[PDB]
Design an enzyme around this catalytic site. Sequence first.
Site, mmCIF file in Angstrom:
data_model
loop_
_atom_site.group_PDB
_atom_site.id
_atom_site.type_symbol
_atom_site.label_atom_id
_atom_site.label_comp_id
_atom_site.label_asym_id
_atom_site.label_seq_id
_atom_site.Cartn_x
_atom_site.Cartn_y
_atom_site.Cartn_z
ATOM 1 N N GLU A 12 66.226 204.063 50.601
ATOM 2 C CA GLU A 12 64.774 204.187 50.466
ATOM 3 C C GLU A 12 64.496 205.610 49.980
ATOM 4 O O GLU A 12 64.871 206.566 50.664
ATOM 5 C CB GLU A 12 64.107 203.939 51.821
ATOM 6 N N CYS A 53 56.900 209.118 52.504
ATOM 7 C CA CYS A 53 57.240 208.442 51.258
ATOM 8 C C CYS A 53 56.122 207.506 50.797
ATOM 9 O O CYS A 53 56.132 207.047 49.659
ATOM 10 C CB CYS A 53 58.550 207.664 51.407
ATOM 11 S SG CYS A 53 59.967 208.769 51.673
HETATM 12 O O1 LIG Z 1 57.786 208.058 54.776
HETATM 13 C C1 LIG Z 1 58.554 207.109 55.077
HETATM 14 O O2 LIG Z 1 59.758 207.160 54.705
HETATM 15 C C2 LIG Z 1 58.051 205.940 55.873
HETATM 16 C C3 LIG Z 1 56.606 205.649 55.581
HETATM 17 C C4 LIG Z 1 56.212 204.370 56.249
HETATM 18 C C5 LIG Z 1 54.748 204.092 56.061
HETATM 19 O O3 LIG Z 1 53.894 205.020 56.124
HETATM 20 O O4 LIG Z 1 54.354 202.916 55.836
#
Ligand SMILES: O=C(O)CCCC(=O)O
EC number: 1.2.1.88
Lengths: 545, 533
Positions: free
Chosen positions: B284, B318
């Site tokens: 991810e 993210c």
């Molecule tokens: O930043 C991340 O890696 C997870 C974000 C999950 C979200 O906010 O839905």
Amino acid sequence: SHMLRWKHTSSLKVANEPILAFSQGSPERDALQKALKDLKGQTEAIPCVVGDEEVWTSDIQYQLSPFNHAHKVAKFCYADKALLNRAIDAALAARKEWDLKPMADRAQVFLKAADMLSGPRRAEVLAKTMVGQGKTVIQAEIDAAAELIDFFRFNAKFAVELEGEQPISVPPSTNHTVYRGLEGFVAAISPFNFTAIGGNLAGAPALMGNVVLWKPSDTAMLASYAVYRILREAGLPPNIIQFVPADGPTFGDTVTSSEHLCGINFTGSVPTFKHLWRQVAQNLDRFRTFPRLAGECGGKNFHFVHSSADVDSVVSGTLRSAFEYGGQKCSACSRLYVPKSLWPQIKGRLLEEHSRIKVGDPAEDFGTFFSAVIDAKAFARIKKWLEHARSSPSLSILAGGQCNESVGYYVEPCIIESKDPQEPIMKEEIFGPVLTVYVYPDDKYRETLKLVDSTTSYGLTGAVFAQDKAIVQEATRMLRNAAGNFYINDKSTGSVVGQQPFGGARASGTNDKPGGPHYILRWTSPQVIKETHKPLGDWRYSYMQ
Amino acid sequence: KVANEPILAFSQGSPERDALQKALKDLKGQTEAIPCVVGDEEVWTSDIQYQLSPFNHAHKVAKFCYADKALLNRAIDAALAARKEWDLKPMADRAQVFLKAADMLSGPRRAEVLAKTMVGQGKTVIQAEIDAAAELIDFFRFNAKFAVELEGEQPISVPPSTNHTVYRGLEGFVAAISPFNFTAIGGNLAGAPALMGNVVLWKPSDTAMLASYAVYRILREAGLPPNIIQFVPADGPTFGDTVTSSEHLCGINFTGSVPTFKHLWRQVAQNLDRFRTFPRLAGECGGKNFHFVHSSADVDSVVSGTLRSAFEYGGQKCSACSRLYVPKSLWPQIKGRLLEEHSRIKVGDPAEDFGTFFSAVIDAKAFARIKKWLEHARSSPSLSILAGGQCNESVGYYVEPCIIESKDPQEPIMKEEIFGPVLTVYVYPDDKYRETLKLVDSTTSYGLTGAVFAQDKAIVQEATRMLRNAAGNFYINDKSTGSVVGQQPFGGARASGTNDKPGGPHYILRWTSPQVIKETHKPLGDWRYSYMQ
Ligand SMILES: O=C(O)CCCC(=O)O
Ligand SMILES: O=C(O)CCCC(=O)O
């Protein structure tokens, strides 16, 4: 009020396609004999197909009948890089509409194709598989009819039912998973030995909303094109699956060089799979997304016999596993481990039964157990192994050992005994009718089980023959990673869709279990949509007060 | 049978707020010495490192060390020797460890893991709560359910044969490499594979060490046997080099930068001939996420949702909104409201002031990267800073929320992931909404999250179609952050990763390599077939 409205999902009732008997006087036997006659003396000119256009290049190729290589069953051509790239462009331009089609509409194509293959087209695909790939009646039947039909029906069921897998919704919001196809195109690269595999490799990704460049096996071209035509006739729109035979390296270079590659669905040799894997890694900065590689890659499969084994079952199951379709199966038994106490009985039965195996023309003589191997390359490789068995001091040929390529690529079933459980012939995949036997002392069955597990680089199929429950439990635990398809008192070949999902790990591939309910998940990239039905509040939280 | 863990309100005088306060006080002035753990052995190397409190970097919240090549190789061997027995355990028994851990996190250990995430990673109360408690607990409970139910997925048996699928763990070890920004993600990256019968080397994030070790200890206390998860902080390249060099590598579970994931992918490819099986890579890798506004939008919801998505946890998600698309007709409202609410955002110490909306960014490296973007915003002819843009690293790595307008919808700031509290806004002509939707889709390399705000059904339907591959987690009238396990499985494609949808029922499938056993209960017939006669 909900702005996105999601339709209820349906269910599908399917069952395995019944295997036919082909008894004398039966309709299917007469239909097959007619379909076989339809092919005698015929050469089909098979073009590349891009959209609905039939295309010819200068790279003319022939497919030969393995048991009568004077018979060119098909003339085809290799797509050049320009045509491959044009095929990519056209598939990409067709993808969005196809992906947006309801899953149930896409499935209907495969269900229709499955009915055609079941009925009016059965004799055709069987005959083309027998004549082009050298299969006997029953080997064609379990493959080009039963397995292909099952892939199409079960995959359609799995896919339609997949849309019923939905997340939890809690006020004030509604959550829905959309099973998107992969964005880009998928390259499907299929092997000679199963007509059904080619149909699944190209068909399963297409079912899930992908578009595909399908490079069929040169030595299975006739049957593969038959399947392709049936899909189009069943309603597959143009540019969803491009029929593009091609030089292997050329094909791989082209698809791995495209920024739009999103997947490779492969069945073939380990080295070729690794090579494609590295090409993708090399080109990683070019792709719009991370391609998904799926590969099934062969094995060196075992039958392990315990002293409690039923002798007759061992012999017939081993003969079938080792020698059906000339041992040209990734699942075929090529190593047999026998306890000293049973070897006299098992050896005697194997040699007696061996003498009764008829090798010959599968179209002209239905009494044929198995026929020629696929091509000159396979014949030459197998010949070199038979010669190795003669020169090697650890090896002795107990039966067969002769071959003749004057008319077809004919190889006798061959049974070898090795005194060395680590002999190269115990390790390397031959893909021919060559069974090697190792006899172990009864009181060393456990040490021997460890050898079964550790001797080769593969983990595809294996069987244990034993009537002792404790032993079956023990062996099942010990051999857990030696075989992805493991058999208790049955032969190591003949996995059936929906019953024994097929595949294994170690050097044998990525083990995505085609034939099972999870395989299609490799070919979808899910999106989740949350619709919220109430205004949001402040940005602050009450605890901040 | 499982449900989502409740998100607590933390109202004045509540049990949870009292407990959290005590837990925070428990950490004030404390430094934990966190060893590598191989099996039950606590190992120190000479390569000493510190985790600093982001909002008060004078506070070293943890001392730990980097595992060297030799220690990592030792952890591989020990894990491999434990794998067979762990994998042979019934799925339910492995599940029990994670359900117990979940119950611990829910109750007696909630305040601890929240406080450690606040002090160590700089989260406010609610950001820690939705992360180290709710999401982690949900991962453990839902994956347990999914895995237990997976054993019920069995093939057809036809007499005289019985067919059974065994969901084997992968043969070898899995390397789990987790990011600083979510305590829960580390727990899942190492936990999910362990649940499925794998053994794991977990390299936790340097800047989240304190909370990560807290989770590790809970798993052990909940009954996880020795050598199933090895706790091995390490230099990134050294860890990557070592794991990709082992013939026993069978998976990498990664969350972090695109280039690092690509590098690991290439290392595996280079070493392909060495491995006993084909390693499975899961990654991810972030996004450049949008909130697209149509003229029919509820402005209040656009404003609050965008403020939260862009600035919560300093934009260090993210999933955070970093590009906002606004139609000209609504810009005076949205600009005015955004700027007014901005002036009310409190940035400060989240332990000492629960009024804090968000706090310092994670570390010196992040601070520097974010400042480079602010400086770019001061330089670019097409960019104008409308509010914020200040930063000060004297006490903590404090960056004020920043709102920028871009006149260029293709500016690098519209494309590149900043991972900071930096929102860029592009104003489009109302009559060009369709062309603008196309720009939302085509501008960036990413495909993670996105939101559309609109109260017109036809617009919503059209936008949903057009943005189908612009976002793996797509929101209608809600913010682009805050996916909840079992409700919005999380992930996206394009450059955002392999999209294995952790949070959903299929994620665990990446960490099993099924075996099918067929037992035939009657002797086999002749090798011949009747048609041959
Ligand atoms: O930043 C991340 O890696 C997870 C974000 C999950 C979200 O906010 O839905
Ligand atoms: O050879 C293959 O690739 C398929 C073998 C399937 C089976 O015999 O179960």
